Design a protein around this ligand. Structure first.
Ligand SMILES: c1ccc2c(c1)[nH]c1ccccc12
Ligand SMILES: c1ccc2c(c1)[nH]c1ccccc12
Ligand code: FES
Ligand code: FES
Ligand code: FES
Ligand code: FES
Ligand code: FES
Ligand code: FES
Ligand SMILES: [Fe+2]
Ligand SMILES: [Fe+2]
Ligand SMILES: [Fe+2]
Lengths: 104, 388, 390, 388, 104, 112
């Protein structure tokens, strides 16, 4: 149900971590300041990896075409992206990062 | 915005209209006649700058944007409908459902994560009176009645017509059609003579500006249009004079047609009665791109049975089509084309010098500006843009 | 104005000329021959980007802009001259007087407040030497002589010629004509052999910069032009060499032609004498739009009586026109067309690498820049734009 | 700077490539076959937007820019080669040497100070395998091998081909050729049936991204390119399905071709073996201008002597050329043209929706952006600019 | 000879007031600060009502195409206008605005 | 005639240009950049313009014809469309008198 990803300190502020899942689409965990968020890693506009894009605040910018998403709502922030990203709630307990295994 | 901002700022009375070079989005538009598209035979066309595909499956029409999501090629370059409910792009085999445009399969990669996660744009299509209408807009469409002139959809109204592509922006077509004084170009029409029509050369306005037109802000179905009332208190001009000398005369026929003339959004004119006392005429000027439009002509006549419809169709083909739709309106075609250069650089919208009868055109420009459901932009054509 | 400011800033010596892509406003320009416009038969043409209509009424020519004031359509799409002195637009019947362009009537509404209150643009028209000149400018025109080369208007000078549309900016035609060294493209012209002409391949300049030309800005008639005085101190080239070996020779004929060449605003060349020792040649490069011009060719030969005039005309039709105007000048046509691409983006005006004989062209660019009567702009075409004090 | 900066900023992963609308400067490019240019017979051509003149003097090829330094006219309008080693502009007789472009004489003015002080642009030219290569770059050129695919220059490799002008930007041609899934468009090619080829409809990728290709930047001769390895872990698709039902199958021939496909800078594809198990195929997409390219097709087959070379040529003319170069690749031509509209406004580089097999193309876009030797600009064409 | 427009106080500086005359063309009364002016209401470049335009200082801008006139002189101030505007004499007597029947 | 007498160093204001005509040879241009004097051919290498009629901006002379420019010290092109270097002539002041060399400097017998 919940996926233990890593220690909060494993990620510097403003970075993104790709979380692979056997037999499933990869996820991207974003560290925005001291807050953590998660979405599907694949941009809904193509095959780009959002974990290889640029994070500006709480908005992830895709490396391929400049499309963007709000990592909290998963809603498109910039064209050409139109299909909402799958969001996954994350929780940090005892300095450990956990991401819901179910798209919620 | 499709026009220089310095020009839009100057035309405060109807900037949205001047900006609507590509037409108004979120309205229904007729593009062809039902008999032109048969079961399983996809047809191409361009509407509001967008390339579209229409197909008839199990008798019902479906409309898909004629541009593959992958590399942007037109699917129509090489049509591949491999199952009754789908169309496969000839390039990399991305396959879409006509029903909702969903990318349901990819023959070149059946395991692609894109399958079921992308959707090709679709538009609502409806057939009425033997005419094919496409809602070039987003979201659930309004009733077709909103975008058609009164009575066009009347149960007993038998519609017949003609369609063709004309080289002029759609607005020049609209304004010429609703232009009270353009009647002057029809003075030598064969219809006037062969159908003994009464036709003045123009009108000497009477009454106040407000009485020159009748704007309809809302119909039972939300219609938006303007009626030309120049003939209400205006004096029909039958003798054209220059320096006091008579150089031309109107037509003193006995048949009185065009009792009322009205223009409606998104751009369709209604002339009643025309070209004969017992008929009703409606013509659309559909935006294809910024330089051309469909000149969709329709003639209507109430018919109670099949015998009357049969008789009507015979009269249409043998008389009304060649004498009116062609013999009369052909002059409207080159007249529209004559205004292209002046407005091509968008400067005509500033330099035009209007006179009294143009109150009708002004009323249309502001009604259109105030009630259109959206301005089509080049971005809608290539892909809406927005950066956070 | 008509060109990228970055380029104009670079051509400090003749920016106005480089900016005059559409030609100079407020000058007279020949557009056709008198015999081409008949009584009551309006003729269309485009001058400096403007569509015009010319009509002959009672023998006199009148010029009205071919664009109705109402919806901007060309009246010529369907000409309706309902009375001798007027023209009625075919659309809503706005009627204009040829003599002053005043909107005198409107058949579709004889009660309109616009009647008598609007005026369609008119342009002065004058016929001389069987040529139709239009003053494409505003206000009362200056005498025609100001915009013609010396002697063109001489009483005894019989003028004959041809006119056609050429695909190149007018300036490229001008500089091709006034170019001292372009004479090379004419080395194989039939006129050279068939009329036994003496024609070098080029010229080796001599003297100082100022001696290369004679700038005329003190002409009592107001004429403004430049005389090419390259042969005055420069030895003409009759033997073209490469590596010292002669590869081409000029023409060694008896007839001495082109003693003096001069270019005059607004853009007319005078070659004297030419194509024969007893004749004078004049050619205009009239701007139609930024890509085209009228190549108005005129040939003059003194004549005292009708007999001489006819002999001259017969001679013109049989020898001069086909051997000179065509057999010689046709090479000038594709020559100026060849320069289009280089100057099309206006960059040619910066990257051109000139040599000595272009000193004449430079003088012309400066004289044209300083003495033109106005820069025609696209705004003049669509409708002048302004907000007064701003 | 050939593309709107806003677009370039969006494609951070391969901006240089998207900007290279006119091609990459400082690379060798084939433009014609040796047998097409004869002794003292100047030929005109446009490469990377520049008009050029090629001539053969005493058997050696020389290339001069086809634009007089004087008034910028093309010398080719009326070629005047007065001496064997020079060309004289037909306008004012400025004369240049083919060998170094030096303005050596001026017939209209032998005393001109410009003589010997101006130099017309010249470009290195090299003939190899019967192909004429021009180095459209500045300074000393690198070894030809750097800009040619592996084995093209092998001693025994006999090269035969065809060349023509195609109306599409060069990059669209490159991506169509290196496209793993476009193979779908060749399913009905006569070459497949007539040469008993095994040809799937597409590929279901396997393994990770890194494994989808092999980026080559360690080649000793300096060539930079990408190998398409989608077939190493990817399940070739032979049964195309829609809704799970087979609607089309691939070709089950015995001959195995295209085991390896690679694209190399400046823009040449290598398919091996093809179109026969014992042959090698290479094709260039040379930029002529922003809208066109030379489609330089070459087929190589090892030959030990003249008897074999002659045999191969006969097979080429009667089979390979009509069956492969044309019977197979003709579809690649209209396919390329079909993508023009989408990318013409440069918006397609942003709105394209890619899928898994495009991973190869993306690798090429990155390699090209990183290893190209320079971006050709319109300034290179009109004349480089710079203000102090 | 004169017509009663309104009370000088009913008009704020920089405002326009249309005056409909029975059996005749309408006029426009502008208040530039504390001075009043009048001209034909109809723009000379078409059929627009200048009273529906914008007044900037002593210059009235037409709502149709942006043409403009100086309300004091009636002379064109901005293209496309070229035909002078008819000016009417204005008089204020005992806190009331009056406009002359005929133009000056 | 190895050294050509131009004028008195005081006859030239800083930032000015002076043309020096020579019998049987092309004219030179002497530039005074502050207190130093430089010289090059007067004729722009891009055409037939006189650089002495141009504008001097520090040690860079701008041609009046097309806006091209050169560095008066090195004679190297500073702005397009100029691409051919100017010949540079040595200048020296003897007794407060400006002299310009009659022959241009060469890449001969000097620093490597
Ligand atoms: C030299 C000699 C003759 C001519 C010339 C320059 N330029 C010309 C232009 C037109 C006709 C003749 C000439
Ligand atoms: C498989 C089989 C043939 C080809 C291919 C993939 N890709 C190609 C590109 C150009 C020419 C031929 C081919
Ligand atoms: S693949 Fe992410 S914006 Fe296109
Ligand atoms: S462009 Fe249609 S599937 Fe690739
Ligand atoms: S356009 Fe000429 S009268 Fe209307
Ligand atoms: S344009 Fe070539 S010599 Fe003048
Ligand atoms: S109607 Fe007033 S500016 Fe045109
Ligand atoms: S002549 Fe000096 S920049 Fe051209
Ligand atoms: Fe009509
Ligand atoms: Fe000539
Ligand atoms: Fe292919």
């Amino acid at each position: 149900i919940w996926l233990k990803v890593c220690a909060a300190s494993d990620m510097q502020p403003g970075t993104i971590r790709r979380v692979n899942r056997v037999g499933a689409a990869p996820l991207a965990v974003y560290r925005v300041g001291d807050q953590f968020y998660a979405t599907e890693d694949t941009c809904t506009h193509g095959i780009a990896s959002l974990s290889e894009g640029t994070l500006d605040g709480d908005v992830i910018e895709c490396p391929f075409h400049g499309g963007a998403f709000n990592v909290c709502t998963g809603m498109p922030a910039s064209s050409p992206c139109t299909v909402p990203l799958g969001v996954f709630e994350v929780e940090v307990k005892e300095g450990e990062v956990y991401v819901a295994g179910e798209k919620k | 915005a499709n026009v220089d901002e310095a020009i839009l700022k100057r035309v405060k009375g109807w900037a949205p209209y001047v900006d609507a070079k590509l037409g108004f989005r979120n309205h229904w538009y007729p593009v062809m006649f039902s008999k032109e598209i048969n079961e399983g035979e996809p047809k191409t066309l361009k509407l509001l700058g967008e390339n579209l595909l229409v197909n008839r499956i199990d008798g019902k029409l479906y409309c898909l944007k004629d541009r593959c999501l992958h590399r942007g090629v037109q699917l129509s370059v090489k049509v591949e409908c491999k199952t009754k409910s789908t169309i496969t792009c000839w390039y990399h085999a991305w396959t879409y459902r006509w029903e909702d445009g969903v990318l349901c399969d990819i023959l070149t990669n059946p395991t692609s994560a894109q399958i079921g996660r992308q959707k090709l744009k679709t538009y609502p299509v409806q057939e009425a009176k033997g005419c094919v209408f496409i809602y070039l807009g987003d979201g659930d469409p309004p009733p077709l009645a909103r975008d058609t002139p009164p009575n066009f959809l009347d149960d007993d109204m038998e519609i017949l017509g003609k369609n063709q592509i004309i080289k002029s922006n759609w607005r020049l077509a609209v304004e010429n059609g609703f232009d009270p004084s353009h009647i002057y170009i029809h003075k030598d029409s064969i219809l006037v003579k062969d159908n003994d029509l009464a036709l003045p050369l123009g009108f000497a306005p009477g009454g106040d500006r407000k009485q020159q037109t009748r704007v309809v802000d809302d119909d039972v179905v939300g219609r938006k249009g303007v009626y030309d009332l120049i003939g209400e208190h205006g004096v029909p001009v039958f003798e054209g004079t220059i320096g006091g000398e008579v150089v031309r005369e109107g037509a003193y026929g006995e048949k009185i047609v065009a009792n009322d003339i009205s223009i409606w959004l998104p751009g369709v004119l209604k002339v009643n009665p025309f070209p004969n006392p017992d008929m009703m005429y409606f013509e659309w000027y559909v935006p294809i791109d910024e330089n051309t439009h469909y000149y969709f002509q329709t003639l209507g006549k109430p018919c109670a049975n099949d015998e009357e419809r049969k008789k009507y169709e015979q009269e249409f083909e043998s008389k009304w089509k060649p004498m009116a739709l062609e013999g009369f309106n052909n002059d409207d075609i080159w007249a529209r084309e004559a205004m292209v250069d002046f407005y091509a650089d968008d400067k005509g919208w500033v330099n035009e010098i209007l006179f009294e009868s143009d109150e009708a055109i002004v009323a249309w420009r502001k009604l259109a500006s105030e009630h259109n459901q959206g301005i089509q932009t080049q971005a809608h054509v290539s892909g809406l843009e927005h950066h956070h």
